[PDB]
Design a protein around this nucleic acid. Structure first.
Ligand SMILES: [Zn+2]
Length: 634
RNA sequence: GCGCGCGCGC
RNA sequence: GCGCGCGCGC
C-alpha cells in the first residue's frame, strides 16, 4: 500500500509546501488522500536540508499501536536508502530500554505520546530541543488533557517563559479540525484558532489549487435522509414484554437485589442497553454453591437476551421474523438439554405462542418502514441495475431478518442478497459500493455513489444535519483565516497562548488536606470489611495496595487470560471478595518490582467512618482525600 | 490498576 | 459535574 515508489499527486506537493518553508502547519485533508506520503516528503526535506556537519531529529506521534507499527514500518522502509536510523518506542518497549540514549542514537523516532509525557515528567528527556521537527498524527486531539496537549504544554512553557534552546518545528495531520460546541461561525473560528494556538501553528494547509484533482478521487456520497414512521399498535411487544417481566421475576426469586447487581440503570426492553445490562449481570456472577445459583441466573438471563433480540427484530423487520427467531431458539433449547428451569421457560413461552402467532400474521401489524426500504431499492435499481448495494443494520439477527424479508419480497425479486453473484451485502460493521443504506443504523468513516439514512428517530436526522452544519462552519472559518496575513495571525495566536498559559498556571489545584483519621474499606457489594485505610500504600503516586497478611485472606484470585504489562507492573490476575457467594470485582494482582501484590480500586469499596457508621462512596482515588502513605520495600 | 478521548442521560 | 456506555493508551 504505502510501500511502492509513490509518485506525488500535485495536491500532495501543494500540501507539503508550507511545512517545507519551515512554517508550523496543520495539514488538513480527507482520509486516504496520502497525508502519510506528505509527511514522508516533509520529513525527507527536513532531514535533507541540514548542511553537512549538522543533523536533524524527527519525532512522529501515533495514538494507537496499529498506526505506530504501520508508520514505523513505512518510515523505516522509505528512509532505507538514505541511511537514517529509524526506531520506535511504545508501551511494549519501555520500560525495557533507556529512552534518552535511543532518542540520541536515532534520527526518526516513532512514539506513542504518553511515552514522551512520561519522560518529560520524569525529566529523563530534559527539553524538546533534541527534536528539530515534531509530527502529530490526528492532530485534532491536541486539546483538553490529551497527551498531545501535555507535550505542547511543555513546548509552550518553553516558548512563552522563554528559554535559550531552539524549539522544533511542529506539524499536524488531520482530516477534520473540528468546531467543538460551536453554534455560530464565530465560535467555530475561535475554536479553530484555539487549536492552532495549542499547536503553535501559523498555517492551515488545505488543497486549493488542485481541488478538481482531489475531488476526482475522494469518496463524497450523495447524502439522503428519509424519516420513516413506525407501527402504532404493537401487541407483540406488549406480550414479549410481559414474558420478560415474568422471567425477571423468576430470576429475582433466586437472586434478591438483582436490581443492584449491575450498575446500568433504568433498563428498557428491546434496547442495546438492556443487552449490556444482561452482559454485566452475567459478568457479575461467574459460574461452588454460588455457581449453581449463577447457572440458573445464567439460563434466565440467556432467555431474557433472546427476548430482547426478538423485540429488536420486531422493531425493525417483521413480527414473523422475531417469532421465527424465538421458535428456532426454543426448539434448540428443547433439543439439546431438558432442565427444570429451561422446560419451565419454554412452557411459559408456549402458553403465549398462539396469541403471538395471531398478532404476527395480522396484516395490520405489518411494518411500514420495510415498504420505504423496498421502494428506495426499486427506485435505485430500476434506474441503474448493475448497482451493488451495502446495507447496514444494527444486529446480527436483523441481518438474517432483512435477508429473509428480501428473498421473500416479490417486489424485490431482482435482488440476490449476501452476508460477484451478490447484489446486496447486508452487514453490521466494517468505497467501491455505489449504494449505501443505513437502515436504522448506529458512521461512514473509511464513481457516482449515494448514501441513504432510513430512521424512525428524528434525533438521528437532527444529529446528522447538525454535523453537516458544523462541517460548513469549519470550512468557511478555515477559508476566512487562510485569507489573513501570517503576522497578524501569529500575533493573535501568541496572545491566545499567553492567556491559556496563565489559565493553566493559575488554575493549579490547591494541594488537598488529608483526613488522617483511619477509616474502613468494606466490600461495596456484600459490605464485608476488606481493610483499613492505614494499611493502604500508594504506588507510583497513582496506584493503591494493602499491606499485611491479614488482607491476603480476604480476597480470592482468578488468573488473567490476558497478562498484559505496563511501564510499572505486570497484571498477572484479577482479585475478588473472598466470601464464596459475593465474588465482587476488587481490582487486580500484579508483579511489581519482583513483588506479587494486590492493586485495588476504590469504586469496589464503601468507606465507613469507624466511630460513627457514616458511609461514603468514591469512584476515583484522586477524590478520596485521606492520609496517602507512600509504598516502601520493607 | 491508573490515565485520555468520545457518545448518551440528568 | 454526576451516572452509564463505548474506544484508545501506559
Ligand atoms: Zn463482598
Amino acid at each position: 500500500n504505502l510501500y511502492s515508489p509513490f509518485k506525488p499527486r500535485n495536491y500532495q506537493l501543494e500540501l507539503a509546501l508550507p511545512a517545507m518553508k519551515g512554517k508550523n502547519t496543520i495539514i488538513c485533508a480527507p482520509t486516504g488522500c496520502g497525508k502519510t506520503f506528505v509527511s514522508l516528503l516533509i520529513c525527507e526535506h527536513h532531514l535533507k536540508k541540514f548542511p553537512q556537519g549538522q543533523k536533524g531529529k524527527v519525532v512522529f506521534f501515533a495514538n494507537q499501536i496499529p498506526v505506530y507499527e504501520q508508520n514505523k514500518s513505512v518510515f523505516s522502509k522509505y528512509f532505507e536508502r538514505h541511511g537514517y536510523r529509524v526506531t520506535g518506542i511504545s508501551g511494549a518497549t519501555a520500560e525495557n530500554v533507556p529512552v534518552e540514549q535511543i532518542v540520541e542514537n536515532n534520527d526518526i523516532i516513532i512514539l506513542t505520546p504518553q511515552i514522551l509525557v512520561n519522560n518529560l515528567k520524569k525529566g529523563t528527556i530534559p527539553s524538546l530541543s533534541i527534536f528539530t521537527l515534531m509530527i502529530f498524527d490526528e492532530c485534532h486531539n491536541t486539546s483538553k488533557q490529551h497527551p498531545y496537549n501535555m507535550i505542547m504544554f511543555n513546548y509552550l512553557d518553553q516558548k512563552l517563559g522563554g528559554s535559550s534552546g531552539p524549539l522544533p518545528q511542529v506539524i499536524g495531520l488531520t482530516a477534520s479540525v473540528g468546531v467543538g460546541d460551536a453554534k455560530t461561525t464565530d465560535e467555530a473560528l475561535d475554536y479553530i484558532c484555539k487549536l492552532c494556538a495549542s499547536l503553535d501553528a501559523s498555517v492551515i494547509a488545505t488543497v486549493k489549487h488542485n481541488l478538481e484533482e482531489l475531488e476526482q478521487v475522494v469518496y463524497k456520497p450523495q447524502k439522503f435522509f428519509r424519516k420513516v414512521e413506525s407501527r402504532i399498535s404493537d401487541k407483540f411487544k406488549y406480550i414479549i414484554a410481559q414474558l420478560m417481566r415474568d422471567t425477571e421475576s423468576l430470576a429475582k426469586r433466586i437472586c434478591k437485589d438483582l436490581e443492584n447487581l449491575s450498575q446500568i440503570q433504568n433498563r428498557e426492553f428491546g434496547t442495546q442497553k438492556y443487552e449490556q445490562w444482561i452482559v454485566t449481570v452475567q459478568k457479575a456472577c461467574m459460574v461452588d454453591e454460588e455457581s449453581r445459583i449463577c447457572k440458573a441466573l445464567f439460563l434466565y438471563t440467556s432467555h431474557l437476551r433472546k427476548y430482547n433480540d426478538a423485540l429488536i427484530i420486531s422493531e425493525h423487520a417483521r413480527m414473523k421474523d422475531a417469532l421465527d427467531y424465538l421458535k428456532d431458539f426454543f426448539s434448540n433449547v428443547r433439543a439439546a438439554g431438558f432442565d427444570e428451569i429451561e422446560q419451565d421457560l419454554t412452557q411459559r413461552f408456549e402458553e403465549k405462542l398462539q396469541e403471538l402467532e395471531s398478532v404476527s400474521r395480522d396484516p395490520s401489524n405489518e411494518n411500514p418502514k420495510l415498504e420505504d426500504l423496498c421502494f428506495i431499492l426499486q427506485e435505485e435499481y430500476h434506474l441503474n441495475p448493475e448497482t451493488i448495494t451495502i446495507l447496514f443494520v444494527k444486529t446480527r439477527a436483523l441481518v438474517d431478518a432483512l435477508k429473509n424479508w428480501i428473498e421473500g419480497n416479490p417486489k424485490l425479486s431482482f435482488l440476490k442478497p449476501g452476508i460477484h453473484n451478490i447484489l446486496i451485502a447486508t452487514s453490521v460493521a466494517d468505497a467501491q459500493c455505489n449504494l449505501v443504506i443505513l437502515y436504522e443504523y448506529v458512521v461512514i468513516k473509511m464513481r457516482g455513489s449515494k448514501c441513504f439514512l432510513l430512521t424512525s428517530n428524528a434525533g438521528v436526522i437532527e444529529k446528522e444535519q447538525i454535523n453537516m452544519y458544523k462541517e460548513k462552519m469549519m470550512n468557511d472559518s478555515i477559508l476566512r483565516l487562510q485569507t489573513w496575513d501570517e503576522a497578524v495571525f501569529r500575533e493573535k495566536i501568541l496572545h491566545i497562548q499567553t492567556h491559556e498559559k496563565f489559565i493553566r498556571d493559575s488554575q493549579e489545584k490547591p494541594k488537598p488536606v488529608p483526613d488522617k483519621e483511619n477509616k474502613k474499606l468494606l466490600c461495596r457489594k456484600c459490605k464485608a470489611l476488606a481493610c483499613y485505610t492505614a494499611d493502604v500504600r500508594v504506588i507510583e503516586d497513582c496506584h493503591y495496595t494493602v499491606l499485611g497478611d491479614a488482607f491476603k485472606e480476604c480476597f480470592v484470585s482468578r488468573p488473567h487470560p490476558k497478562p498484559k504489562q505496563f511501564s510499572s507492573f505486570e497484571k498477572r490476575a484479577k482479585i475478588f471478595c473472598a466470601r464464596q457467594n459475593c465474588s465482587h470485582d476488587w481490582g487486580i494482582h500484579v508483579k511489581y518490582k519482583t513483588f506479587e501484590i494486590p492493586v485495588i480500586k476504590i469504586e469496589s469499596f464503601v468507606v465507613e467512618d469507624i466511630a460513627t457508621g457514616v458511609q461514603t462512596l468514591y469512584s476515583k482515588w484522586k477524590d478520596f482525600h485521606f492520609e496517602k502513605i507512600p509504598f516502601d520495600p520493607a
